[PDB]
C-alpha cells in the first residue's frame, strides 16, 4: 500500500493477518495491546481488520 495509508511492513502485516485469521474478533484491551506492540493506535488495527473484510467484499 503506497496510496494514502503508510506501507505496512512484513512483520506488521503478518501479525495482523495471523491475529485476524486466528481470531476474527478481538477485545478492547487485546486490540490496544496489539496496537501498542505495533507502536500504533487501536484505529490502525480496527481499520486494518475492516479493510480486509471490505477488500474481500469489494475487491473480491
Amino acid at each position: 500500500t503506497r496510496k494514502k495509508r503508510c506501507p505496512y511492513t512484513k512483520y506488521q502485516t503478518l501479525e495482523l493477518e495471523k491475529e485476524f485469521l486466528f481470531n476474527m474478533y478481538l477485545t478492547r484491551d487485546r486490540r490496544y495491546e496489539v496496537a501498542r506492540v505495533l507502536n500504533l493506535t487501536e484505529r490502525q488495527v480496527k481499520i486494518w481488520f475492516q479493510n480486509r473484510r471490505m477488500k474481500m467484499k469489494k475487491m473480491n
Binding site: K4, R5, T41, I47, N51, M54, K55, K58
Partner: peptide, 20 residues
C-alpha cells in the same frame, strides 16, 4: 520531525474503492 500527517494518514480506509 512533524505532527501534521493526519489521523487517517497512517490509517486510511479507502484503499478498497473498487466495488464492481
Amino acid at each position: 520531525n512533524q505532527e501534521f500527517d493526519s489521523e487517517e494518514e497512517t490509517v486510511e480506509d479507502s484503499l478498497v474503492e473498487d466495488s464492481e
